[PDB]
Design a protein around this ligand. Structure first.
Ligand SMILES: [Mg+2]
Length: 465
């Protein structure tokens, strides 16, 4: 909040995608939760404590949706709620500093995080529902529909595995693979089959492979992939220190999580990493965002021949899915892959609080540990919003400026972000004008929303020094 620090995007900022999100998408998400709760009830006993508790949650969700529609003031969490649902104290502190804010004129970042907190308090109050994930039906459904791409990537892992081992025993072929797995991780479900369909080293190196990468990369308007490459290849070559730690601050479950696992597996098998740590959400959050249990659901899905019908176990497809699931379990057992959750990730705090200054809500604890990482990969749009504080930076703002203390407090970071929100920085001169003018043609009055569409992406690096 300094003189030259821009304000955060607000639900009241006229013509922004945040304004549209709050007035239009949020009541849909809550209504979807009511409907999914109804769908779940179909599959169980129609009376008793669990049933009644769920009817009450549905009523409360209905009223909550209407509160957002009526643009009422955001109420604090009661002491009872804080204790039963383990609500961080940060929310009530925020509301004291922002008295009487209402859904119609409130910071987009805080209110969105608050939304999922209010939803979770309803579930945590109800003992038969305290661990239920109201977004899980959707998470599973979306992943189920990714069958084709899932099998293609599993086949690729299995194919590459001997060559990755030889690489580890020693390449610009390794560089091509690095770009592929980074970009597949970046695009998540949106990954075009053109990238995935090349499942052998030969196909990846081929003209077809090159064209697929060039198509992906033409949409990545800031691309610091080479800087991260630099970091991991130098650490691998460094014979003084052996540990190479890579962290993943995660976004969505399912295919995006699968691709992050695939990137981790690739780094581990090639020697570009020796330990990968995954950071997940501790409550159902932003609809699809990974929780610890979503990893185990993914591994179970991979082996589930009703879920992913890869045919008899003997098929190549079934063998490849089973191999990857087994590799995951193996890496978790040996500690090459480790999953963690933390309440910090589901507070309203932006990542300028990933700093020694943040002594109340774990920011300083996480920061001290992340300093030890060779590379912290932040996935997705929400993490990017928290890196940049979700502020109205000019769209050419230097990346180091937008991330505040993260430019200088010893965390080496890489943001992989599909652009799905108004905030956008580090663009070349003139690019925002160019993309806006093209976008404006089919989206009148909304030219600036090119970076809200998910069609463009950025890959942004900072050494933290
Ligand atoms: Mg997400």
């Amino acid at each position: 909040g300094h003189m030259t620090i821009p304000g955060r995007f607000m639900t009241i900022d006229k013509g922004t995608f945040g304004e549209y999100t709050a007035s239009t998408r949020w009541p849909i998400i809550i209504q979807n939760a009511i409907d999914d709760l109804s769908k779940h009830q179909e599959t169980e006993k129609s009376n008793g404590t669990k049933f009644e508790q769920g009817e009450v949650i549905k009523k409360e969700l209905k009223e909550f949706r209407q509160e957002i529609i009526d643009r009422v003031p955001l109420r604090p969490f009661t002491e009872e709620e804080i204790k039963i649902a383990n609500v961080p104290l940060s929310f009530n502190e925020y509301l004291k500093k922002h008295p009487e804010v209402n859904w119609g004129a409130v910071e987009w970042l805080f209110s969105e995080v608050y939304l999922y907190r209010r939803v979770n308090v309803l579930f945590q109050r109800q003992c038969e529902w305290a661990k239920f994930d109201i977004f899980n039906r959707l998470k599973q459904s979306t992943f189920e529909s990714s069958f084709y791409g899932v099998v293609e990537l599993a086949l690729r892992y299995e194919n590459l595995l001997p060559q990755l081992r030889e690489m580890k025993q020693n390449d610009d072929i390794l560089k091509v693979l690095f770009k592929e797995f980074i970009e597949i991780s970046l695009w998540g479900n949106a990954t075009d089959l053109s990238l995935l369909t090349n499942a052998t080293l030969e196909d990846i190196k081929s003209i077809q492979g090159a064209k697929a990468r060039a198509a992906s990369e033409s949409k990545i308007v800031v691309n610091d992939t080479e800087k991260a490459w630099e970091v991991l290849t130098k650490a691998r070559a460094d014979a003084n220190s052996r540990e190479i730690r890579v962290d993943f601050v995660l976004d969505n479950s399912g295919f995006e999580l699968y691709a992050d696992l695939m990137l981790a597996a690739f780094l581990l098998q090639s020697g570009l990493a020796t330990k990968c740590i995954f950071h997940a959400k501790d409550i159902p959050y932003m609809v699809s965002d990974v929780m610890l249990k979503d990893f185990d659901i993914l591994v179970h899905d991979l082996r589930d021949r009703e879920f992913f019908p890869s045919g008899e176990p003997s098929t190549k497809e079934s063998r490849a899915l089973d191999l990857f699931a087994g590799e995951m379990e193996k890496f978790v057992s040996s500690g090459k892959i480790e999953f963690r959750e933390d309440s910090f990730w589901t507070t309203e705090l932006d990542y300028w609080n990933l700093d020694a200054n943040e002594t109340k809500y774990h920011g300083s604890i996480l920061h001290k540990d992340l300093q030890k990482s060779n590379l912290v990969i932040f996935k997705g749009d929400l993490n990017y919003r928290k890196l940049t504080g979700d502020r109205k930076w000019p769209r050419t703002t230097k990346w180091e400026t937008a991330i505040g203390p993260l430019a200088t407090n010893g965390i080496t970071s890489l943001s992989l972000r599909t652009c799905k929100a108004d905030v956008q920085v580090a663009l070349p001169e003139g690019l925002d004008a160019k993309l806006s003018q093209e976008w404006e043609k089919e989206n009148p009055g909304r030219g600036s929303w090119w970076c809200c569409s998910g069609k463009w992406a950025v890959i942004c690096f900072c050494s933290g020094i």
